[PDB]
């Protein structure tokens, strides 16, 4: 139903060791389609999904030119930011920007993003109305005043409501086989004796797309949370994701425990037990 196109820019200064590195990656939902790395042997915008490989050399040359200009712009930004904070010339600093457009459950523009962090902390963000800004401190209000004179929110509203959703829809169509067909999790439950009277039950979800998923444990149909561990959802490397949830249980009560799986690719939520 809902879909997103999201870009992630990272600029890292390294004084005395060259000019700042700039890396850009772009995604549709949880699938990467483009990268650019100023430190690459031959920096260029590069396809990372098959459904942008037919865009043509003109498209890719234009994305490459944008990234090269963007890297120099982020370098200027890093110099300006160091000045705002009266920071020394020798320290390394990080500038991150995330932006993009979220289509809602109707396939129309629901939310646009344009937010930035400096050295890992919120710096300035375009608000959901796409007309106002949240600035974190006095340095960010310097940036905000410059952007307001440029009608920055207006330009970003234009991109977010136009180019961003237009090309997101194009990518979604060209790759609809892999972007608009959720892949359900493949599940199983494992068992490990912990002691002479307790055991671990681990509920697995593999091979699913998109990454969003919920795994929970129940006992006699009652939620079990105090002694349940969840690992962070992790990429399998083939475009799908993995997760598991483990609970420690008194030995002999395993058959009373149920794992509950919710995922977009399932018709209804899934209930699982251990099969000895």
């Amino acid at each position: 139903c809902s879909h997103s196109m999201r870009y992630f820019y990272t600029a890292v200064s390294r004084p005395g060791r060259g000019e700042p590195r700039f890396i850009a990656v772009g995604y549709v939902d949880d699938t990467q389609f483009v990268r650019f790395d100023s430190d690459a042997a031959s920096p260029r915008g590069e396809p990372r999904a098959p459904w942008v490989e037919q865009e043509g050399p003109e498209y890719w040359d234009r994305e490459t030119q944008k990234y090269k200009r963007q890297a120099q712009a982020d370098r200027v930004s890093l110099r300006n930011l160091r000045g705002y904070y009266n920071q020394s010339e020798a320290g390394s600093h990080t500038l991150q920007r995330m932006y993009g457009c979220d289509l809602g459950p109707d396939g129309r523009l629901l939310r646009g993003y344009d937010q930035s962090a400096y050295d890992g902390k919120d710096y300035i963000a375009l608000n959901e109305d796409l007309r106002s800004w949240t600035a974190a401190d006095t340095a960010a209000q310097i940036t905000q005043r410059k952007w307001e004179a440029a009608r920055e929110a207006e330009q970003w509203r234009a991109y977010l409501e136009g180019t961003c959703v237009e090309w997101l829809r194009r990518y979604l169509e060209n790759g609809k086989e892999t972007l608009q067909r959720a892949e359900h999790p493949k599940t199983h439950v494992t068992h490990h004796p912990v002691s002479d009277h307790e055991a671990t039950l681990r509920c697995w979800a593999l091979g699913f797309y998109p990454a969003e998923i919920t795994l929970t444990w129940q006992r006699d149909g009652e939620d079990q949370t105090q002694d349940t561990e969840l690992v962070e959802t992790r990429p399998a490397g083939d475009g799908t994701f993995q997760k598991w949830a483990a609970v420690v249980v008194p030995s002999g009560e395993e058959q009373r425990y149920t794992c509950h799986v919710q995922h977009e690719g399932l018709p209804e939520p899934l209930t699982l037990r251990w099969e000895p």
Binding site: E63, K66, A73, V76, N80, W156
Partner: peptide
């Protein structure tokens, strides 16, 4: 399709 070069901070 990326934004067409942002303003500096």
């Amino acid at each position: 399709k990326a934004y067409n070069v942002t303003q500096a901070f």
